[PDB]
Automatic annotation (TrEMBL), chain B:
Biological function: Inhibits both subtilisin and chymotrypsin.
Species the sequence originates in: Hordeum vulgare (Barley)
Family: Belongs to the protease inhibitor I13 (potato type I serine protease inhibitor) family.
Protein name: Chymotrypsin inhibitor 2
Gene assigned in the entry: Ica-2
Residues of the full protein shown: 22 to 84 of 84
Domain of life, per lineage: Eukaryota
Molecular function GO terms recorded: serine-type endopeptidase inhibitor activity
Length: 281, 63
């Protein structure tokens, strides 16, 4: 039997599933450590590797990209977990190696591959404390080209009054996502600052792991793909909506939580996002 | 203890020694400063970001 992880329910993805919308024909790039395409609860549609010493994007030597991918799009069937957008066209864009790290040029090459291959959504469950002009240019170009770009806010927690959101989440063109638990409480590690946009579940998130396994991971890495999957659900219901409109719909229909410094606009609600008229619940 | 700001500017060797005294079960991973990394949070992990000379270039923390 299949299980629905709590975070998929918490963002109200099942409401969209019951309307008949599951992310069909929406192309989502998971820009990450690869995706294990042999997992029976995932279907990988394509991809490419920008990691010079690890050339197969369908081999995930870290495990992280595979977990992120299952939150986006684990298959709707009688096994494992269910993804937010279980019919999405999933692309493994490998820019991180076995040790979980990549050079800025690898991430940029991956964002460029996504643009050239007409991806509708990019998820980047990744980040660093500094930006670069070339990184900002790549994400700005993807957004100018019509892609919804979503990234983890970072796991730096608080630092008095300073923002601790990392890059590329910290760029205005990117939706920066923080983490809450099942009670809607901010996770203590979740980055903070005026760049934090929305929150999603990022504590004890069950998903797919390489070698036909499943497991619970924590992180703003886990929160980001709830929002990327939500964007794919919204686009499957409104295939002409622009990335501007998809982003606004998610921002404008959050459930407001605490102060925006710690919670941004609050928890995403994809049911409300995918209606024509938007307001907060 | 979950952050070691006193280790910035020290050798990677001394940082590993100190962190393992405070957290003997730590899974330490050494990475180049200025790379991009996954945003999972792992309480058992301590990443050490080094400059090209193998000195600590960012405050080590659990995660
Ligand atoms: Ca399944
Ligand atoms: Na942003």
């Amino acid at each position: 039997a299949q299980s629905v992880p709590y975070g998929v329910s918490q963002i109200k993805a099942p409401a969209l599933h019951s309307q008949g919308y599951t992310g069909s024909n929406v192309k989502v790039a998971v820009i990450d450590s690869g995706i294990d395409s042999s997992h029976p609860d995932l279907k990988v549609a394509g991809g490419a590797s920008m990691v010079p010493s690890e050339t197969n994007p369908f081999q995930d030597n870290n495990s992280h990209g595979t977990h992120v991918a299952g939150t986006v799009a684990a298959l709707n069937n009688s096994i494992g977990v269910l993804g937010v957008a279980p019919s999405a066209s999933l692309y493994a864009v490998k820019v991180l190696g076995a040790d979980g790290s990549g050079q800025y040029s690898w991430i940029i090459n991956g964002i460029e591959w996504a643009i050239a291959n007409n991806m509708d959504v990019i998820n980047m469950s990744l980040g660093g404390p500094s930006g670069s002009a070339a990184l900002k240019a790549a994400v700005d170009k993807a957004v100018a080209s019509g892609v919804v770009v979503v990234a983890a806010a970072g796991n730096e927690g608080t630092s008095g009054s300073s923002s601790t959101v990392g890059y590329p989440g910290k760029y205005p063109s990117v939706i920066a996502v923080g983490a809450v638990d099942s009670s809607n409480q901010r996770a203590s590690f979740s980055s903070v600052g005026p760049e934090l946009d929305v929150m999603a579940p990022g504590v004890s998130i069950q998903s797919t792991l390489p070698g036909n396994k499943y497991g619970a991971y924590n992180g703003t890495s886990m929160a980001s793909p709830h929002v990327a999957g939500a964007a794919a659900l919204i686009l499957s219901k409104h295939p002409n909506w622009t990335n501007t409109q998809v982003r606004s719909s998610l921002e404008n229909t959050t459930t407001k939580l605490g102060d925006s410094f710690y919670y941004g606009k609050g928890l995403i609600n994809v049911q409300a996002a995918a209606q024509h008229h938007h307001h907060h619940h | 203890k979950t952050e070691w700001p006193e280790l910035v500017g020290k050798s990677v060797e001394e940082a590993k020694k100190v962190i393992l005294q405070d957290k003997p079960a730590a899974q330490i991973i050494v990475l180049p400063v200025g790379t991009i990394v996954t945003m999972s949070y792992r309480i058992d992990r301590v990443r050490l970001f080094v400059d090209r000379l193998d000195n600590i270039a960012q405050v080590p923390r659990v995660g």
